[PDB]
Amino acid sequence: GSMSLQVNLLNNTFANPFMNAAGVMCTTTEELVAMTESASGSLVSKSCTPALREGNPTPRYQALPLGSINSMGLPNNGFDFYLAYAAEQHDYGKKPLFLSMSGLSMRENVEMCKRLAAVATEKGVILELNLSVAYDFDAMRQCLTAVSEVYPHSFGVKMPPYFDFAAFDAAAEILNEFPKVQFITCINSIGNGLVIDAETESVVIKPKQGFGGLGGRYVLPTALANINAFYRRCPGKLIFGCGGVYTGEDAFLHVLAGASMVQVGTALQEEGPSIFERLTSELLGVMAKKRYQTLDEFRGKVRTL
Amino acid sequence: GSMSLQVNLLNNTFANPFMNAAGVMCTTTEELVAMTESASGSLVSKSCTPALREGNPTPRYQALPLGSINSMGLPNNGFDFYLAYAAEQHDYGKKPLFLSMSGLSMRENVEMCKRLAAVATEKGVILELNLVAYDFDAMRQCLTAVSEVYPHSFGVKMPPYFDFAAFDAAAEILNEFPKVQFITCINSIGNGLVIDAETESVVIKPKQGFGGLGGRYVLPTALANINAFYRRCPGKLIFGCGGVYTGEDAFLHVLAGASMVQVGTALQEEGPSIFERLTSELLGVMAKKRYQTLDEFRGKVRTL
Ligand SMILES: Cc1cc2nc3c(=O)[nH]c(=O)nc-3n(C[C@H](O)[C@H](O)[C@H](O)COP(=O)(O)O)c2cc1C
Ligand SMILES: Cc1cc2nc3c(=O)[nH]c(=O)nc-3n(C[C@H](O)[C@H](O)[C@H](O)COP(=O)(O)O)c2cc1C
Question: Which residues carry the post-translational modification Cysteine sulfenic acid (-SOH), per the record (chain A) (predicted)?
Answer without folding.
Answer: 143
